[PDB]
Amino acid sequence: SSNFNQETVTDIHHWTDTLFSFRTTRDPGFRFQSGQFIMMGLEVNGKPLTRAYSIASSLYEDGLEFFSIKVPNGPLTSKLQHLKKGDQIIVSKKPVGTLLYDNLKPGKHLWLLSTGTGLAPFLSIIRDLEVYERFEKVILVHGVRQVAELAYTDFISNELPQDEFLGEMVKNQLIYYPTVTREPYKTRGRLTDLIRSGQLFKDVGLPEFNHEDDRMMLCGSPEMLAETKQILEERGFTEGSQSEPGEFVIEKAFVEK
């Protein structure tokens, strides 16, 4: 240890039997940029049992928040699902990640495309002042299999526009687009199918991707990333990085083990 900060679990909310969210304290010395991730976990036998976790809380918040998977035989999330108020976790002290504004060229639009727990880095980004100073529109798209998997669906639409520090920017600039595949819902299908059929652009009121105006952030499943990366690169969009900004950056929501 001592490369970690000890934080106390303050709140827990389970969404389904596979998806929960818990908030913790935040160390005064802990500083991070929106879209980054850290190594988060538990102290087991005096050794760090951690996995990669996007930071889902805003930088303006006095605390940290994590949007987590619950896997039955998973080394971390089998113990982590049984967290309670007062429990201790460890968080690494060196943030890292590709989902940075500076890896993207200046633009008029920012498309945050996520499936499942890939919403988590964008929960930090949409609750940041600077994204709304740099992009005219922020379109958040969240793809899930079931309606119950739409974590934070009421906080984004009902409570986030009411924010006394960020609300008017959310009302005017944030577009939220939830889609569900395997249950009846107002929107249906994969987000990749929605980009193909052109329905994504019909539903949000904005024109198709073009190399001048649209910048994109992708965080989701391996199938969704490779598929959408082919969509974007065959259209002429290039992948940015710290040393060479571009139009889209990508981050793995998980890796199949």
Ligand SMILES: Cc1cc2nc3c(=O)[nH]c(=O)nc-3n(C[C@H](O)[C@H](O)[C@H](O)COP(=O)(O)OP(=O)(O)OC[C@H]3O[C@@H](n4cnc5c(N)ncnc54)[C@H](O)[C@@H]3O)c2cc1C
């Ligand atoms: C950059 C990065 C950021 C990440 N951010 C988050 C985050 O914010 N929240 C989070 O819950 N996980 C996140 N992950 C995934 C993280 O590794 C999982 O917490 C971890 O794999 C599951 O813990 P485990 O040890 O119990 O299971 P593991 O032994 O690591 O994996 C068990 C199984 O669960 C699957 N799995 C893992 N994570 C997910 C997921 N999110 N959705 C669906 N299936 C999954 C794996 O494919 C595997 O088959 C991130 C991964 C990376 C690389």
